């Protein structure tokens, strides 16, 4: 199977006719409802999770994994990594590894940088630690439309960027309107198109055995 680069920004799925719906900054109190919706549609998603959220909601981390979704790293503290030293960037990653090792029994090989901010130093750390670096090719901007009257604008951006060939989509399951309204709109549209709605690792051709590794 494919070799997938480490320490190099990945924006787009490679498996034809796939789409990866992804959710950042959780788990949150809305994540369980989103998991219910994903199971109704029989799809898989990817969750790039944070430190305090994972420590507060370990049972949601376990439920994400048991229902076949992928857990990726979003750093512990959500710091813009180019504002940090090499050692500090390492610590942002390994501190979340301690949390995830204890909650889900392994650690991710996929990460998403806060705000998509990268520089050479950040990419060097991710290469050295063995992380695939994922940003996005669809960005819902749902954080800025988190109200019933605004959330349709995130769907319009989603559809337009999907039509432009985007296939790796950023939303936040910390936002109520993303879970209660936008996710169903995205899932209906991807179902209508007959897309394979799957994890980031799967949409890159990576077997699930490679989305995680044992403790360092
Ligand atoms: Cl440094
Ligand atoms: Zn984030």
Residue numbers in the entry: 24 to 239
Give excerpts from the publication.
Chitin deacetylases (CDAs) are found in many different organisms ranging from marine bacteria to fungi and insects. These enzymes catalyze the removal of acetyl groups from chitinous substrates generating various chitosans, linear copolymers consisting of N-acetylglucosamine (GlcNAc) and glucosamine. All CE4 enzymes are metalloenzymes that share a similar fold and five conserved motifs forming the substrate-binding site. This binding site is comprised of several subsites, with subsite 0 binding the sugar unit being deacetylated and the minus and plus subsites accommodating the units toward the nonreducing and reducing ends, respectively.
In this study, we analyzed AngCDA, an Aspergillus niger CDA that is strongly expressed in the mutant scl-2, which in contrast to the wildtype forms sclerotia, a survival structure for harsh environmental conditions and a prerequisite for sexual reproduction. To further elucidate the substrate-binding site, the X-ray crystal structure of AngCDA was determined at a resolution of 1.81 Å. The enzyme crystallized in the space group P432 with one monomer per asymmetric unit. AngCDA adopts a distorted (α/β)8 fold, as typically found in CE4 enzymes. The conserved Asp–His–His triad (Nε2-H97, Nε2-H101, and Oδ1-D48 atoms) plus a malonate ion (O6 and O7 atoms) from the crystallization solution and a water molecule coordinate a zinc(II) ion to form an octahedral coordination geometry with a metal–ligand distance of 2.2 Å. The malonate ion is found at the expected subsite 0, where the acetyl group of the chitinous substrate is normally placed and hydrolyzed. All five conserved motifs can be found in AngCDA, with motif 1 harboring the catalytic base (D47) and the metal-binding aspartate (D48) and motif 2 containing both metal-binding histidines (H97 and H101). Motif 3 includes an arginine (R135), which properly orients the catalytic aspartate (D47) and a tyrosine (Y138) forming a hydrogen bond with the acetyl oxygen at subsite 0. Motif 4 contains an aspartate (D165) that enables the protonation of the catalytic histidine (H195), and motif 5 contains a leucine (L193) forming one side of the hydrophobic pocket for the acetamido's methyl group at subsite 0 and the catalytic acid (H195). We found that Aspergillus niger CDA strongly prefers a GlcNAc sugar unit at its −1 subsite and shows a weak GlcNAc preference at the other noncatalytic subsites, which was apparent both when deacetylating and N-acetylating oligomeric substrates.
